[model samples]
Target: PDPCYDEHGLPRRCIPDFVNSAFGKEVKVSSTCGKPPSRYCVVTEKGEEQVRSCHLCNASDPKRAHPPSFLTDLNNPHNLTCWQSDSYVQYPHNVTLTLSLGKKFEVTYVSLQFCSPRPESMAIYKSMDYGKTWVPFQFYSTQCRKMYNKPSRAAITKQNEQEAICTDSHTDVRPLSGGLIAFSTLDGRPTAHDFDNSPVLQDWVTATDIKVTFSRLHTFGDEDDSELARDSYFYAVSDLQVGGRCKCNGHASRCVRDRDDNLVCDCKHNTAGPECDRCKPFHYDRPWQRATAREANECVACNCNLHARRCRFNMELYKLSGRKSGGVCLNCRHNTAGRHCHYCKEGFYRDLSKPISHRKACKECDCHPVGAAGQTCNQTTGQCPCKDGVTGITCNRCAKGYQQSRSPIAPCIKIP
Candidate 1:
């Protein structure tokens, strides 16, 4: 319905809404863009089998999401701890992982809020080892779908004007804190009793909303806390952005300048925003742009090894629609699920396999380098199983050979 009227018009054509304007109107709803940033999880593992000790029952059960086998406090390197934590009481899918940047530090936290078309389950997973492994934190699940078929308003014109107001109440992941990592659990050992059914009516959307304070025992001022305090040094692992994920995000976010305000976003070194999806100057074309952009720096430096395999700037790259706007990082391919294609499915690998042709053919190959030994094959070569007398991928060096003749020309020609 038209809200304004023209001075001399009897009936004027409805003025275009943001849908049909040059600078489209932003959807007024607050985004989970930076909320309970978490992703959903199902029972899955790619490698070794493991069990999770339940906090409720004290019994061990199959574990789905596990943190890195070895973890060192971001604050204290000498204090190493295995990373482990249970998913938020919420199911999964209704989560967002948000990252904040600072000169000497970067912090990440999950925001809990469900946006339109909310899901039954949601979660956000994070990895500390440059996304080598993930630890589940926030989770949300929709147990049942609610119904909202009745019409609202127009029918109530009696003494009391009360219109029908009922929405299909699908389950949601609600916020439990205001700031990042506030009262959020860092070490949540699941209890056996956590898996239980409850009253259908009361338990509807009643996800387990747990809270705990998060703190890395390391101090920011310490020089050893490079991962936490180093200038622009941090990485985040989450879902890949797809169409229908969010309407506004441009598949990436970076600082940019806006006409409406004083230097908003300033188009970070290599980002185009509103949703930071596109690449800008120093970032895509220039290598040093990341000197300032924390998110890109983390990804490009740690994950891509200074080489961006899949780089699409502000051009609709997921679900297949809409032009690139800006504001957030979107999806990554090659099984890269959520926003950053950071985590790999169990049994599968990433950079370890590079050649696109070999990836499809190398699924069944499970060869791996011994602990801290041998090189990881690039996506195609899986792993090079060492030979008895000759170890390593190239097999140029002799292995298990004792008393062998040493050759200055050949380092491993010695035989036993």
Candidate 2:
């Protein structure tokens, strides 16, 4: 089929096809292992002392005491230990961890489990333009809530008299849509974290880095009441999972690998190039915006009305206007104008009711067929020469006393 053209003369493809490619393959990180302990010291079960001045980058331990080891222990919440902060602090502390997936990727989903102790809340953020700006991701899970039990035991144990006043504090953790899970102490279980609901994920967005911040609450028990309002707390993260696909530009997901082991999108559907950025040979026109993991490509076909001279891709316009004009048809013909030559010249007018592709898209002036010198008339005024008694611009009426001819081919006649 001939390519459809738009106002800007761009070609249009019927919607394009976007494939889901994995963006989280062979990811990298800035500092995989959290900050190490102050000193490498551990007391053995035999009561023997073991201490090393500096124990950095310990990948051998399955305990996951180091940050880099988190990758090795993927989805298991129990077998892996979480990365902890070096020092304890009060609630509302901002602890950060940066992740890099080797190169740029359209991140789709992310999952993470905090250390066993858990925190009040955790905020996840992504950065597309390096570290310039960051935005919060829309998440499916809700933040976990704190449940508590009353001091019932104290009230029941009164000495032969009425009930005594109870005084005790206990808290329970409950999971909600925010993906919050309870701790083992409170019989809490691990939950899945899905980040595909994020707005940025609406259409498979790109990013090079991810930063996570945990907002924890302070803990104050009777043991530390004497200290300076001790607001000491710690946090640990047991798991982190990131997902995405290559910038396929609404094409096939079967990507190729370069010598450097980098992914290259395998484009299809008359696609001009990989990264599926442009349309192929006869398929040039409006390039649809890339589709996200959740949505399918919805590119519209370009029907140029059979009046365009050449149809091609318009990357420059797409970037400047963000209007998806990459496949615009150009150089319209057939005495017509507009992106698809769907309009008529001054001497002609388009029949609003008919489709642009119709044979009579532009009709000639309504001049008298025989009374006028020719079928053609004034381009602007739509006027033409008429027979002896013919007058109006269209030669529709005749002289005052003359009777009008019913047939447009005959001149006016005088009554006897």
Candidate 3:
């Protein structure tokens, strides 16, 4: 007369009722993507007029031009650039693929599915700092790493029965794992963004893992009860089995581990929490460099690291485009320029003085040391401008009233 119960007597391994709270709510579909919706073919009439604009003329016909969509009108005008389709009968993806206003833009109430014969490769990136820094997507790769621990089996089907499918413990999650298998050691793997294999992704992840609550972006209060009601949905990361990790020293994606097989975060002295997720006393940290999916919120550079030439500016330059482009400033040789020593900008040292080939070491011409903060190094003579009341290649001698103290040193005494 009684139902079966576990130790807690709760329905173990069953989906919880609260999990379905946000289902069937009204959400406005929109795109930060300026890409026009595909598949708009004029069955009876000719395709939409193609607009071509040049600096000299207004080539597009104003009278016949179509009005922008509501979503476009809201944000499209601000777009500096966009890509348009070459032909008509525009599909949603074909018309224009604009950069999706690369920031903390949000979309709501969307479902996506990814099917495959997937490309041989799988790569994903996340931007915790709102696409400022792209981190390699690791969900699938982490899973593959776990799968690598076990040996590959010859057949997934049962031995006794020809038709019996795999019932092994290792094969239990195979169905749900049908998506792209990223970061495999398998030889000749497909590369991300290769023209040959146009990789596809689906928004199969739930909101929780990304720390977003799925809800209507905007709504009217008078909307129907079935339509306007909201609830919580999450991308169930607990299912991913992502082990706890400290942002190792605040930047790397590696998880901190102890000899005893515990997650021990080796954070700075002022950090705490089991995963070192937050700052403790006398310290704060944030993602200085970010990529598509991962944020590098670690201590990028300390003032203490300045002595070793790994200067603060060394990491500060990476903030530009989250260090995706050519922004790092490492070493400097003779005849280069600037704090990072990237190159000899115009008006600086025009040539290297020997093996030394950096902007930092390049001494400017003696003629104009005071002009450009002594940064404009002379390409020919490799001389430095004289300081006040001083002259010479190294500014060694003092003027008539001042006596020479030392080479470029202070305390040049006044002559009696």
**Could you say which candidate leads in lDDT?**
2
lDDT of the structure predicted as candidate 1: 0.27
lDDT of 2 by residue, 1-416 (tens): 32222356443322222322222233234333334423232111223532222333344544435553443254454465455554454343456666654345565455555543444445456666556677544211123222112133332221212221111111112211113332110011111123233332332246556666555543423254457532234444556666555555545545566677865555544453445655555465556444445443444445479776467667686577576555566766655566566677666666656677766666677877756656665543457667776777776678787777776666787778
For every model shown, what is its TM-score relative to the native structure? Answer: 0.16, 0.42, 0.19
Candidate 3 at 363: error in angstroms? 3.4
Residue-pair clashes per candidate: 84, 38, 32
Candidate 3: worst-modelled 10 consecutive residues by lDDT: 232-241
Evaluation by TM-score, superior candidate among 2 and 3: 2
What is the lDDT for 361 in model 1? 24
State the lDDT of candidate 3 residue by residue for 205-320, as single tens digits: 11112221111111111135466333211111101111111222232223345676654434432345543444442222222321112222332322211212433233354445
How well does model 2 score by local distance difference test? 0.48
